A paper describes a structure:
Protein disulfide isomerase ([name]) is a major ER protein that operates as a molecular chaperone and a folding enzyme by catalyzing the formation, cleavage, and rearrangement of the disulfide bonds of unfolded or misfolded proteins. [name] consists of four tandem thioredoxin-like domains a, b, b′, and a′ plus a C-terminal extension, which are arranged into a U-shaped structure. Among the four domains, a and a′ possess a catalytic CXXC motif, which is not shared by b and b′. In particular, mutational and cross-linking analyses indicate that the b′ domain provides the principal peptide binding site in PDI16.
To determine the interaction mode of [name] with αSN, we carried out X-ray crystallographic analysis using the oxidized form of the [name] b′–a′ domains and the αSN peptide. We successfully crystallized their complex and determined the crystal structure at 1.60 Å resolution. The crystal belonged to space group P212121 with one b′–a′ molecule and one αSN peptide per asymmetric unit. Even though the two-domain arrangement was extensively affected by the crystal packing, the b′–a′ domains showed an open conformation in the oxidized state. Interestingly, the αSN undecapeptide adapts a β-hairpin structure in the crystal. Because a crystallographically neighboring molecule was accommodated in contact with the two domains, two different interaction modes were observed between the [name] b′–a′ domains and the αSN peptide. One interaction mode (termed contact-b′) was mediated through the b′ domain surface proximal to the a′ domain with a peptide-binding area of 391.6 Å2. In contact-b′, the αSN peptide was recognized through several hydrophobic interactions involving Leu38 and Val40 of αSN and Ile213, Tyr218, Met222, and Phe267 of [name]. Furthermore, the main-chain amide group of Leu38 makes a hydrogen bond with His270 Nδ1 atom. The extent of the interface area and the number of intermolecular interactions suggest that contact-b′, rather than contact-a′, primarily mediates the interaction.
Numbering used by the authors:
A (entry chain B): 31 to 41
B (entry chain A): 208 to 449
Write the structure that this text describes.
Amino acid sequence: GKTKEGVLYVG
Amino acid sequence: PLIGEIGPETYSDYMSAGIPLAYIFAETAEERKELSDKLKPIAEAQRGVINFGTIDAKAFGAHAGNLNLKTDKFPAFAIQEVAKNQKFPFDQEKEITFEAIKAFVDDFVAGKIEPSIKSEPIPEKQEGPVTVVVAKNYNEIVLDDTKDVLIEFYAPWCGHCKALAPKYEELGALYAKSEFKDRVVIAKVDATANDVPDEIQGFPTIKLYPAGAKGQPVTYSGSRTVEDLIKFIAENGKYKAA
């Protein structure tokens, strides 16, 4: 996944 | 490929691999390719030990913050120890060369690099009555054995923290014009933006680190009024200051 700021995340 | 692309689709597989991920951040596809090609032999040497990928530092520059890298200075390189939640940023003031990245990765593999401690920068000026603590000045300020230090661990989004802030500034101001102005510090740290040694279970947390008793800080549990906090400092500090 990514946040609107462009940080990646799992799930 | 050996050096894949880290993005929203591939992140979970790197996080599930059970080995560190080395990120090659650059702002253009050409630079990503140049650096990938350059660093391939290191990724090969580390096959199954450390995964390497490029990451689009334009789209995902913010992700650099997850590695304690500056989010505005590219290209950049860092290793995330996924098991241990540890981050090892390569100095963004150094050029990403084969030799330097090889030496960095070799040092990481050898155990020679301490995990980075998340910190805001040292504030450029310390004026206003409340002292701003960051991870990089916590030891110098909070553990200064000559001062009673009241330290508020807060979050910027925290409602009680917001409510406390004007009273906390009033408190700092009182001490700053007191006869204890050179031995009391009224300080705060954004615990969301700095790793602190303290275990903080909720916001705000207020602790007094007394002069001469830094291993026994006292956690505040009162009513969060200025008067109560003065009393707390006066009762629990070395200098009985008010």
